[PDB]
Design an enzyme around this catalytic site. Sequence first.
Site, PDB file in Angstrom:
ATOM      1  N   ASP A 205      13.048   3.594   2.491  1.00  0.00           N
ATOM      2  CA  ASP A 205      12.404   3.569   1.412  1.00  0.00           C
ATOM      3  C   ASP A 205      13.238   3.134   0.161  1.00  0.00           C
ATOM      4  O   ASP A 205      13.277   3.665  -0.697  1.00  0.00           O
ATOM      5  CB  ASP A 205      11.848   4.981   1.046  1.00  0.00           C
ATOM      6  CG  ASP A 205      10.846   5.068  -0.038  1.00  0.00           C
ATOM      7  OD1 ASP A 205      10.387   4.243  -0.247  1.00  0.00           O
ATOM      8  OD2 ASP A 205      10.790   6.197  -0.641  1.00  0.00           O
TER       9      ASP A 205
ATOM     10  N   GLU B 292      26.405  15.235  -5.902  1.00  0.00           N
ATOM     11  CA  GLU B 292      27.034  14.597  -7.258  1.00  0.00           C
ATOM     12  C   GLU B 292      25.823  14.508  -8.173  1.00  0.00           C
ATOM     13  O   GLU B 292      25.004  13.775  -7.853  1.00  0.00           O
ATOM     14  CB  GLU B 292      28.103  13.936  -7.044  1.00  0.00           C
ATOM     15  CG  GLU B 292      27.602  12.541  -6.301  1.00  0.00           C
ATOM     16  CD  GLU B 292      28.237  11.219  -6.091  1.00  0.00           C
ATOM     17  OE1 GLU B 292      29.285  11.341  -6.862  1.00  0.00           O
ATOM     18  OE2 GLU B 292      28.000  10.470  -5.231  1.00  0.00           O
TER      19      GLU B 292
HETATM   20  C1  LIG Z   1      17.853  10.833 -13.467  1.00  0.00           C
HETATM   21  O1  LIG Z   1      18.211  11.325 -12.147  1.00  0.00           O
HETATM   22  C2  LIG Z   1      17.395  11.675 -11.477  1.00  0.00           C
HETATM   23  C3  LIG Z   1      16.151  11.506 -12.029  1.00  0.00           C
HETATM   24  C4  LIG Z   1      14.998  12.015 -11.384  1.00  0.00           C
HETATM   25  C5  LIG Z   1      15.119  12.748 -10.279  1.00  0.00           C
HETATM   26  N1  LIG Z   1      14.055  13.045  -9.715  1.00  0.00           N
HETATM   27  C6  LIG Z   1      16.211  12.861  -9.497  1.00  0.00           C
HETATM   28  C7  LIG Z   1      17.364  12.360 -10.281  1.00  0.00           C
HETATM   29  C8  LIG Z   1      18.698  12.580  -9.835  1.00  0.00           C
HETATM   30  C9  LIG Z   1      19.998  12.462 -10.267  1.00  0.00           C
HETATM   31  N2  LIG Z   1      21.026  12.890  -9.623  1.00  0.00           N
HETATM   32  C10 LIG Z   1      21.089  12.907  -8.190  1.00  0.00           C
HETATM   33  N3  LIG Z   1      22.096  12.954  -7.437  1.00  0.00           N
HETATM   34  C11 LIG Z   1      19.970  12.645  -7.534  1.00  0.00           C
HETATM   35  C12 LIG Z   1      19.752  12.929  -6.278  1.00  0.00           C
HETATM   36  O2  LIG Z   1      21.022  12.835  -5.693  1.00  0.00           O
HETATM   37  C13 LIG Z   1      18.776  12.970  -5.492  1.00  0.00           C
HETATM   38  C14 LIG Z   1      17.506  11.743  -5.922  1.00  0.00           C
HETATM   39  C15 LIG Z   1      16.350  11.828  -5.025  1.00  0.00           C
HETATM   40  C16 LIG Z   1      16.428  12.846  -3.929  1.00  0.00           C
HETATM   41  N4  LIG Z   1      17.258  13.738  -3.456  1.00  0.00           N
HETATM   42  C17 LIG Z   1      18.602  13.703  -4.346  1.00  0.00           C
HETATM   43  N5  LIG Z   1      18.819  12.632  -8.325  1.00  0.00           N
END
Ligand SMILES: COc1ccc(N)cc1-c1cnc(N)c(C(=O)c2cccnc2)n1
Length: 342
Positions: free
Chosen positions: A154, A106
């Site tokens: 983590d 999501e």
């Molecule tokens: C601003 O949101 C993010 C910023 C940087 C990164 N790398 C990921 C996100 C983000 C935004 N929406 C998400 N749903 C997710 C994840 O579900 C997610 C985050 C880290 C690793 N795997 C999935 N991650």
Amino acid sequence: KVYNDGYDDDNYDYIVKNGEKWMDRYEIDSLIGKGSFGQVVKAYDRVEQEWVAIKIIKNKKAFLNQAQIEVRLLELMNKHDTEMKYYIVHLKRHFMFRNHLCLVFEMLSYNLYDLLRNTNFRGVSLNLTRKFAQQMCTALLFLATPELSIIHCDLKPENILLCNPKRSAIKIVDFGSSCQLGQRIYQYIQSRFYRSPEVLLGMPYDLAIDMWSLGCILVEMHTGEPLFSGANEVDQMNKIVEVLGIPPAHILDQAPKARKFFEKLPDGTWNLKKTEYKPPGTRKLHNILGVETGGPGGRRAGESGHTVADYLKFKDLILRMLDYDPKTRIQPYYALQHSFFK
Ligand SMILES: COc1ccc(N)cc1-c1cnc(N)c(C(=O)c2cccnc2)n1
């Protein structure tokens, strides 16, 4: 020369192109994140008619296997967390696409570090921190489910996202480092700032290491700065001892890496090895939170719900989360019964 017929770069990542259309469903908008595992893109699912975050795993066996571990855990939580009531990011779907494993989550909002940086690293209110504390303890209670017994391994402000920037709901993300309880296989785990003493000391550990991370995270959310911002493991332990004092001897007498930080004198007691730091236990959490001085830096003087009474209930809970003994450390069910949530 050319990798995956040109779809991947030289380090196995899929070259994302804005506007691409996967399988006549996902419309790739832009790249929103990168990591060792691969990439995270902002996409629009047209079957469900909604924005989604797609995690494109690198075209490499090592990262592919690490993601199947992640998928098994996520789907295992979907069997238990029906209707998503326990503040875990929902894995909707996964598929293969041009030799990359893709995971559809999501579309969530900013992380708690983003939010902190926009305060210029001086914290949010104790009332909002309470809202995050209750939601995190609730998620940790879910991971504690006996049939799950999941260690996130983590926890940190970047791994906690807001659902809607206009709402105080938070979600835990990124279970790629996560494992279920079991016999010990890894010892260098957790992010340093949030790494528990039993991990620093090379001792057996359980789900209580996530409760330690939370205690550091919650204080950081209100003050704005990491509680124990160690530049290395020696510096980390020294910043823990500043606040909480020397760990108990019955633990240090058992820790395989006790002497990386400490020394046993002829008299049988443990003390810090010389490397700077305050004497053990004199950087009191009472003063860090500014219980009687109007909060961190006095910036909360006169704000409702920021009384000495409220700060004393926040401090008590935190000190229960930062317990040196993982068997005594407070558990999610108990944390949620704390007076700080009344
Ligand atoms: C601003 O949101 C993010 C910023 C940087 C990164 N790398 C990921 C996100 C983000 C935004 N929406 C998400 N749903 C997710 C994840 O579900 C997610 C985050 C880290 C690793 N795997 C999935 N991650």
